[PDB]
Every structure is written in structure tokens, then in C-alpha cells.
């Protein structure tokens, strides 16, 4: 790998610089290099890895949606034939997106998840595995689409099981996992009732635990609770 010659600490330092410069592709490459050093990641380092790839894949997803919409309209009745270019370019972006997802999933499988024993790390990585299978599911149309969806579900479910046993209901990782798994139900698994039930129960159980928190922890938890509420408002 091209980062093999750079010190782990230097990769982390440059990932932080790349974040400040809004250079998220660089940030992700630096964090991939850091993961490949083989040591476990601290909480802050896991956050850097997450932020970097979230921004990269988020831009790819937004572009894929623009192109998919154009392609959809080109196939409606009365549209002029414009050739293969829209499909080709949507496929190009899609293949790059799948490459990023495969890279993240590869880092999780080799070997972040298997070395993650504390709930804070293990739930975080399993949530990420669910997220990146979900992004693969957003673009999938083939023989393995059901298996891709089930891979996302299975990762989210293992993360959910650990988080309920090992984390308080206000833990931001537990909350963000529930938020995203709820979106999985709504947008991927055709299960809006499960999505709504999960969001509501998560919100209510967090509400009941806020009294235990410091002011700073309260701020962190209520931020994600508001996202759950936002989705509930969108869906009801």
C-alpha cells in the first residue's frame, strides 16, 4: 500500500489536516493506511475513519442519485433516445461507490471487527458494516441483492444485540445505530412499521435515561434523539 512507508502517527495527523482542508478522499486514504498498520483504533481514530468514508461515499451516493434520476427519465415514454452515455456514466459512478464500500468492508473484516472486544468499538464497527452493506443495497439490482440486504440486516442486528446489553440507552453509538437501522428498515427492507417502531422506542428509552447524564453527555445524546424525531416526523 502507498501509505506503508508512513508512520501511523503521521497518517493520523495528516487525516486531521485533510479533514480541516475538506479533502475527504485524502482523509480516507490516510485512515486506511493507519488501519493497515494492524493496531486497534482508539475512539478518536475510529471517528476519523468514519468521518472520512462517510463523506466520500456520501458524495458518491448523491451523484449516483442524480444520474439515476436522469436515467429514469430517459426511459419514460416520449423521451428521445440519447444513447448509452447516461447508463455508462451512472455505472461508472456506481462501480466507484461499490469499490469504496468494498474497501471499508475489507478493513472491517481484516481485521477490525475480530479484534474489537469492547462494546464501544465492536458496536461501532458492526454499525459501519451494516451501513456499507446498506449503501451497496441502495445500488444493487442483481442475483445477490437479497443477500446484500441480509448482510446489512445481520450486521445491524448483532450491533443492536450488543448495544442493548452493554450500553445505556443514551449512548450516542447506540442511538446512531438505531437511527440507521431504522432507516434501513424504511428505505431498504420495505418495513416502514418496523422503522417507526424502532425510532420511537429508541427515542423514548433515551428520554427516560437523560436524567443520569452530565450537561455535555446530554447535548450529545439529545442531538441524535432529534434526528430520530426528525425521521418520525417525516414518516408519520
Amino acid at each position: 500500500g502507498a501509505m506503508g512507508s508512513m508512520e501511523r502517527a503521521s497518517l493520523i495527523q495528516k487525516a486531521k489536516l485533510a479533514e480541516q482542508a475538506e479533502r475527504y478522499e485524502d482523509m480516507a486514504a490516510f485512515m486506511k493506511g493507519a488501519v493497515e498498520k494492524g493496531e486497534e483504533l482508539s475512539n478518536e481514530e475510529r471517528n476519523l475513519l468514519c468521518v472520512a468514508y462517510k463523506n466520500v461515499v456520501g458524495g458518491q451516493r448523491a451523484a449516483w442519485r442524480v444520474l439515476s434520476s436522469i436515467e429514469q427519465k430517459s426511459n419514460e415514454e416520449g423521451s428521445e433516445e440519447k444513447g448509452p452515455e447516461v447508463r455508462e456514466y451512472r455505472e461508472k459512478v456506481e462501480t466507484e461507490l461499490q469499490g469504496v464500500c468494498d474497501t471499508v468492508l475489507g478493513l472491517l473484516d481484516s481485521h477490525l471487527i475480530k479484534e474489537a472486544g469492547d462494546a464501544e468499538s465492536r458496536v461501532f464497527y458492526l454499525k459501519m458494516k451494516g451501513d456499507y452493506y446498506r449503501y451497496l443495497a441502495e445500488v444493487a439490482t442483481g442475483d445477490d441483492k437479497k443477500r446484500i440486504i441480509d448482510s446489512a440486516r445481520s450486521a445491524y442486528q448483532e450491533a443492536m444485540d450488543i448495544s442493548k446489553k452493554e450500553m445505556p440507552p443514551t449512548n450516542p453509538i447506540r442511538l446512531g445505530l438505531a437511527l440507521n437501522f431504522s432507516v434501513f428498515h424504511y428505505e431498504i427492507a420495505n418495513s416502514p412499521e418496523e422503522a417507526i417502531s424502532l425510532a420511537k422506542t429508541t427515542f423514548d428509552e433515551a428520554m427516560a435515561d437523560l436524567h443520569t447524564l452530565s450537561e455535555d453527555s446530554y447535548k450529545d445524546s439529545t442531538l441524535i434523539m432529534q434526528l430520530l424525531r426528525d425521521n418520525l416526523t417525516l414518516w408519520t
Binding site: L179, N180, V183, Y186, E187, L227, N231, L234
Partner: peptide, 5 residues
Amino acid sequence: FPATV
């Protein structure tokens, strides 16, 4: 789109 983190 709905919110995710």
C-alpha cells in the same frame, strides 16, 4: 432523504 449518522 431521512437522517443517518
